[PDB]
Structure formats: C-alpha cells, structure tokens
Design an enzyme around this catalytic site. Structure first.
Site, PDB file in Angstrom:
ATOM      1  N   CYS A 148      17.029 -23.769 -15.271  1.00 13.75           N
ATOM      2  CA  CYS A 148      15.713 -24.396 -15.230  1.00 13.75           C
ATOM      3  C   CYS A 148      15.604 -25.359 -14.052  1.00 13.75           C
ATOM      4  CB  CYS A 148      15.439 -25.140 -16.539  1.00 13.75           C
ATOM      5  SG  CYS A 148      15.600 -24.113 -18.018  1.00 13.75           S
ATOM      6  N   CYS A 181      20.138 -27.340 -18.725  1.00 15.46           N
ATOM      7  CA  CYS A 181      20.456 -26.025 -18.178  1.00 15.46           C
ATOM      8  C   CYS A 181      20.388 -26.038 -16.654  1.00 15.46           C
ATOM      9  CB  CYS A 181      19.495 -24.972 -18.734  1.00 15.46           C
ATOM     10  SG  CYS A 181      19.957 -23.269 -18.343  1.00 15.46           S
TER      11      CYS A 181
END
Length: 130
Positions: A53, A50
């Site tokens: 993150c 992701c």
C-alpha cells in the site's frame, strides 16, 4: 501559473475510514465513476503497515491522472494490520475483498490487487479503458 487542459480528464481524492464513510462518499459520487482503494490504516508517520500500500499509493495516485474519464478516488482504510485478517469483515463479506490493497472500480468487475496495485502499467490502464 499558466496551465492548459484540452478536454483532460479529472480525478477527486477522498480520504475515508470504514464502510460507513466509504458508502457516504460513494453515494455522493454515484453520478460519476468511483474508485475505492481498500488498504490498511496509516500510522503516525503516514504509512500503511503493509509495504505494498505504501509502494502502491504513488503508483495508483499517479495513474489516476492518466484516466480519460472523470472519476472519484476514495482512500478507504480497512483498519489495522491484524484487523484485515478478520475473515468476518464487511469487506470480505459484503465487498468480498480478495487481497489488500484492493482497487475496485465501482461499476465494473475490473479490480487491481496488491500486485496489480503496484503495476503502473495496469493502473494507467484500468483508468484509460472503460
């Protein structure tokens, strides 16, 4: 190195993976404030599938410093990309996670979601206030 800390807060970084470990580290720091950062697992390079993150990591770690209380950060790795989707995960079943990365403050219903995980203004807040 001549440093100075006039009653300055303190944070503790703890890397873990799964619910088991997460629980252990938690119970260990149950006496003090705990901060669980549920995010995807890191790759060989050390990045989370992701893009959040990865852009929130530094946004949450830096803010933790602004904290005015002795807390204990905990980098909990949910698992794989296609694994986080699993709606039958102990994270969405027990922890009832909304959307990762999910920053839950063990003790208070205050939590920062992906968007709230990339917002330093919020990160430095959830830590400042109780």
């Amino acid at each position: 190195g001549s440093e100075g800390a006039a009653t300055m807060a303190t944070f503790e970084e703890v890397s873990v993976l799964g619910f088991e470990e997460f629980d252990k580290a938690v119970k260990e720091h149950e006496s003090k404030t705990i901060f669980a950062y549920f995010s995807g697992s890191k790759d060989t390079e050390g990045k989370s599938w992701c893009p959040d993150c990865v852009e929130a990591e530094p946004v949450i770690r830096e803010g933790l410093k602004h904290v005015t209380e002795d807390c204990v950060f905990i980098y909990c790795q949910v698992g794989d990309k296609p694994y986080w989707k699993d709606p039958n995960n102990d994270f969405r079943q027990k922890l009832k996670i909304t959307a990762v990365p999910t920053l839950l403050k063990y003790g208070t219903p205050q939590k920062l979601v992906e968007s709230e995980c990339c917002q330093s203004s919020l990160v430095e807040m959830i830590f400042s206030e109780d």
